[model samples]
Target: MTLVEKILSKKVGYEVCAGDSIEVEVDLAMTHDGTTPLAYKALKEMSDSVWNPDKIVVAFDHNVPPNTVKAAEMQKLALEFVKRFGIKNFHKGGEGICHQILAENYVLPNMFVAGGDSHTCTHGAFGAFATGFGATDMAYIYATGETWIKVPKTIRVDIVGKNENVSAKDIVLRVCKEIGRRGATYMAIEYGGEVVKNMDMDGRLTLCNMAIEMGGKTGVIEADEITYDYLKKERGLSDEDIAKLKKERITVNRDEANYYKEIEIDITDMEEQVAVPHHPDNVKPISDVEGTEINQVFIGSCTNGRLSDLREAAKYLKGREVHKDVKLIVIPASKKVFLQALKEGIIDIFVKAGAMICTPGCGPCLGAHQGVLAEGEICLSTTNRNFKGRMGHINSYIYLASPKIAAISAVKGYITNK
Candidate 1:
């Protein structure tokens, strides 16, 4: 059994998993600005309030940067909701996206967390059982501090490939393409192998972050020193706390005798990857789609908006100017990164290159906020998801790519023309 399987099956003192279900408790339930209004409505239907106040977190993220009056009002609602519950963990106004902030402040080992947004699976980078749910399901978990889960069969993805200019985004886009959009339905994906092990924590988070898009319960990687370093910094853990937590990390690896229901992809041959119009799975390398033109270029999201991502773009874009006709938007994932980039002059570089350096917020990712596109406009973005109407205006086309590609596209005004 994998670590996920073992945890679900093995009895831990009074708590136990029998068959496909467990009456286990949860560590926390969360909803961000985009998902919380609906969650609030759903939670209001119950007779009582939440099962525990401390265990629920709400942070305003999406629709930030206040692209419109509507976006500002939505921000207001998030603040009011937090006040109503006396929520202790509420953060607002471009602080950071939910996944980034939660990883930095809340996630812990061996814990189960549910958030009212996809990509909550990002937390699995820390050895957590993190999953996403819709507003109604979130309301129940927020109220009861418990929820039902069908133990998932595991998918072991061994990403065996390398390329220097290629990025963590490229690897994940390849995985999504191989798995197909719904390939991992009702599954828990355990990413391993030499390729996965070599990735930094930011890279690993980007991979696990999209598992839910494939209808997966979660995605996981065996925690290591990179995870330890990030957690130690974020949690401010003492030596004793670090030692105790390290002891509990269970490593899941494929043994000589082990078997996977299936395996896919031989990545050594893959060159630079790109996600074509409308789907993360609609992927191709720069060679296949080299001439596609774009009007807007955006680089930011919980997925690829880290300081390192910006620096990588800056490496290629240091003195280059953005295409005169295209609009480029750059948003950091957190206030910390935003401030750091400001100091590093990355923000100044982007601005000088014609990119709009926005607040550390969800911005245009949701289509309801900053950089809202005009009808029939096309955009190349670094944010996760290119679903229809994802950034408002269904006619607006969105192509997803790595920060490198996005920055390059911002300069060339097209993914294929570079």
Candidate 2:
């Protein structure tokens, strides 16, 4: 069995396979300001109360500080729902993005997590079965603490070689080019081999966060020592607690489980990658798009807003300044990341380098508020997705790259790997 199969098999009390439909109890369910109001509206029609308040997480991040009256009203309604349901995990605006908050505090391996945002698949890095659901589906889970799902096929990606200049962002961009959009539809992408095995947890999260770009059901990695270490340090788990978890951990033997397809890439000779305008799958090496002038650069989102990404960008900007004509914005993924950056003087480095630091929230990734572009403008972002009009005018362009390239581009006012 695959890792996902083992998780679901335990949940349903039987061994399962691809395409089997089953209803399992949800271990965690989350919604943000953008979707909670709609979920609450749909929830009222089916039930008068939530199944379990503690298992539900409500966060307000999309329109932090309320961009408009309409946004403010949506948040007000969401707050009403939080109060009505007695949700103890409510995170007000400025707290953090929902996915980051969940990873920092709630997600656990071998469990099922249902979230209202598409990027919720990010939690799969911890070996959990996590996926996004629409507001109505979220409402159903809210009402009954149960949701049905059809088991998905699996795609195995093995990374064997390494390059110091290549980060998880580059590897995933390469994966997107190889898999293409819709290549892995309704299937899980399982990452393994030496490169991924030795990778940090933050990098693993970055890899899984972009599974949706390939139309994947979820992106997962097997739990290992790195996973246990993060849980112990970040979640404050004791040795005894860790041992108990280890005994209950689910792992798959590759020789026994079936995979729909398999691909491997050696990054020893890899170059930096970028997903150019119109779609994320439109990826190419940085050399192909070198010297493409950019008007803005943003280094934040559920995808690449972690401390390691910020540290990578900071290394390039510490004693330098951004280009006079370009605008640079950096938003940390969570308050925890923000505080750490602050303590390490990374925030000071950003400010001194002329980068605007926003509160811990989704500032410009959604194009709802901060950093919206003008007609014919261009932006090089670390965020996932560059769909037309995703950041501004239909004619505007957004190129996606790693934080290393983002910082360098901010200094040169053009796209370049170094």
Candidate 3:
């Protein structure tokens, strides 16, 4: 069975196949300020209280510090819901994006995680069954600690050789180009091979974070030594805990497991990739779009806002100055990440290089606040989506690239990896 299949089978206490409908208990459920109010409204009609307060995570991220009166009121309502339920996992403004918070504190391999934000698929980096749900569906799960899912077929992507210039963002962008938007609809994208095996936890998360761009239900990677090391070092899991997790680890018997489709990409010859103007799938080598002028450069989002991403950006930006006409914004994925960057002087490098650092939350990624664009403005962002008006005025454009490209572009005022 596929890794997801194996995890689901354990969850439901029975063998499950692709396309099977089954209801399984959720190990974790999350919602942000924007969605929690809507979910609370739906949940109140069915139940007086949550099924389990400890299993629910509520974070205020989409509009941290309340950009508007409506946003403030929504957060107020959501806080009331938290208080009423006595939720212990409540994260207020500036805490971080929902996905980052979940990974840092809650997610575990072989568990099921559901979140209100579409990018919830980000947690699949931990080898968990993670996906997004709408407010109503989240409400149902919140009320009962259970939800239904239609098991998805797996699309296995194996990466072989690699290049130093290519990053997980570039690799995923290439996959998006090959898969196209909607090509993997309702399917899981399983990543494996030598490149992925050597990839760090931050890069692994970046790979899975964009599965939704290809219309994938989730992205998964088999747990390995890298996974264990991350859990041990980052999460502070005890030795006994690590041993228990090892026994529960799910591995795919590649020869026996069924896959809907299979693909392999050799990145040894690949260059930095960019997804230009309005679609994540409209991708090309950086050479094709080099020297394209940009007005703003954003280097943070759940997609690429981790510490490693910051380190990569800092390497390119340490002794440089941002272009006079460009505005660069840097946001850490979480408070923990922000603290670590501060300790390592990454934040100092960015500020000295003319980058504006925002609080640890979704800054300008959703077009909500921070650095909204003017008409005809263009931005090079490390964010996942590039849909029209995703970052402000409909006439504006957004190009997606890795943090390295974003920092370099900030210095040069145009898109170029070098």
Candidate 4:
């Protein structure tokens, strides 16, 4: 069997062939506060009982520090679901957001994980076959602990270059814009090359996490030293556990003679990146739309809410405060990252710089309760999606950018460099 076949076979823990329709044990199932309530409703419609609480995870991070009573109620409902199901992996207490926590905790290479939110594909950074499903599908997974897969073709993106302002997030946005939205639907995107290797594991993860926006089922980056370092520190796994983790590595690479469906870009000179206006594919250079004006600048999300992400943003923010017109919201991705930021005094920098720190949750990114954009307002966000109406009113403008670019834009009050 080939690499993909080997992984499916092992993941099912049996001999499996391509296009097999079989229910397999999932390494993990996830849904955050925003989706949990809906997912729960769908789950109830599917079955009277949950299939396996142990396999499920419920997170209440979206509206952390609960911005309003309505949001608080949604969180309450999500918590109740966790309690109802006896989910052992429930994450609360400013534990950051769902995607961050999963990457920080549960995800390991070769695992098959599903999340109700599309960005669930972010864990592909660790080589896990993670993907997002709709709330109904998620509800079914919650009740049956099973889902089907046709398996996907793999697209290997070999990126190379060492540009100063550019980072992995730039690569992802660039790729998405190049491919256009809906480019890689139902396919697997494998990102590797010298540039990927140079990034810390977190950076690679950020790249893979954004794969879903480009139409990928999952975005995977092969595990390497950076992967080991991040896992050791973030997950606190022991040496034995690390060895076991390696054993779980999923193989999905094509053979030397294997052909890719298509081979696209290998960008060399990238600058700090951002996606402008209602679509992740509407990408442009930092130089392209700087100083355009903005009502808000948000820095946090699974893609760029880790320590490195924060620090990179903070670096640009040193001795600067967010533009008085732009309200900057800083949210750490996970509890660990939040605590680390506090320990590192990064939060103080944000606070002192006049930015408000929000609790660890998934709200602002969802654009429902928190960080809702006012009509005709503009926002530069570090989260994954920039879909239409994603940030509330259709009239509100949203710009998706990396941490560094987001911070600088916050300082400048637009997608511009100071």
Clashes of each: 4, 0, 0, 13
Candidate 3 structure quality by residue, lDDT tens digits, 1-418: 8888998999899999999999999999999989999999998888887999999999887897788898889999999999999999999988888898888888999999999989888888889999999989999999899998999999999988968878999999999987888999999989999999999988899999999999999998888878888888767778898898899888887779889999998799888899998999998788999989999999989989999999999999989999999999998989889998899999999999989988888878677777899999999999998999888898999999999999999999999877
Global CA lDDT computed for model 1:
0.79
In model 4, state the lDDT of residue 145: 79
Worst 10 residues of 2 by lDDT: 359-368
Predicted candidate 2 versus true structure: per-residue lDDT over 153-175, tens digit per residue: 99998888969988899999988
**Whose TM-score is higher: candidate 1's or candidate 3's?**
3
Tell how far residue 327 is off in model 4, in angstroms: 1.7
Write down the worst ten-residue block by lDDT for model 3: 361-370
Residue 154 of candidate 4: its Cα lDDT? 68
Q: What is the lDDT of residue 207 in candidate 4?
A: 82
Q: Name the Cα RMSD for model 2.
A: 0.9
lDDT of each: 0.79, 0.90, 0.91, 0.77
How close is each model in CA RMSD to the real structure? 2.4, 0.9, 0.9, 2.4
| Model 2 global lDDT (CA atoms, 0 to 1) | 0.90
Which ten residues in a row are the worst by lDDT in model 4? 251-260
- Of the candidates numbered 3 and 4, which has the greater lDDT value? 3
lDDT (Cα, tens digit) per residue for candidate 4, span 173-246: 88786666787787777776778778887778788887878888778777765787778887786888777777
Score every model by TM-score.
0.93, 0.99, 0.98, 0.91
